[model samples]
Target: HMSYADSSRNAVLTNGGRTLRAECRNADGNWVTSELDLDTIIGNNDGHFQWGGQNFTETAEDIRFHPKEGAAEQPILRARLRDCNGEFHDRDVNLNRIQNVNGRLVFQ
Candidate 1:
């Protein structure tokens, strides 16, 4: 529905870190919301991250958390997306700007 650029920016964790939600735009210029279960996407393929569609796929090369404990700090999402060219592009995003809602990690 939405392009990768938009979807990546809108990505957020929900359902107590069990789900990853993102928003995209279709050709009609509308919003398309997509949600993927963390269990289904994370730690899959024998601990090798793999998710996305035909055009591209992302693999979490590595991950880390700040403070090293508690529910206060978010994890650093170090991953790479492989485009159609079969090349992996690396990126890192700090997932610290979130708040706990009961038990869920809601993006701020």
Candidate 2:
């Protein structure tokens, strides 16, 4: 199975006239990569967040991808966040179902 890093290139937060951006990378060394648009991902809402049967509003922190354990090329993508009290929550998404239109990969 392939591993992945949590790249927050697409995560953003705007509250109380303050804005926050989250950037992460694949730590598991998986082939799968992620591209996030914070403004598109986190809209002007504050409630339970649902993705692939997982739910959480606040307290989401990281997103991970696992390319190794799947029937097809489907990889496991996770979304994590932090609650107002600093608590953490997470959600898993299937890469096969999601689409990426932008971003770049650098090979060294």
Which 10 residues in a row give candidate 2 its minimum summed lDDT? 99-108
List runs of model 1 lying over 4 Å from the truth: 1-3, 6-9, 44-108
Error of 1 at 42 (Å): 2.3
What are the RMSD figures for all models against the true structure?
12.1, 11.0
TM-scores of all predicted structures: 0.36, 0.32
Task: Output the number of the lDDT-best candidate.
Answer: 1
TM value for model 1: 0.36
Clashes counted in candidate 2 amount to 22
Off by over 4 Å in 2: 1-39, 42-60, 71-73, 84-86, 99-108
Give the C-alpha miss distance for residue 5 in model 2, angstroms: 18
Clashes of each: 1, 22
Each candidate: what lDDT? 0.42, 0.36
For residues 11-108, write the lDDT of model 1, one tens digit per residue: 65566544556554545665667555544434323233434211112334333323222464334555554444556556544433333332233442
TM-score of model 2 (CA atoms) = 0.32
Q: Write the per-residue lDDT of candidate 2 for residues 1-108, one digit (tens) a residue.
A: 121122324333334212222333434533344343322333212323433323332334454445433665444545555545555555454433333222222211
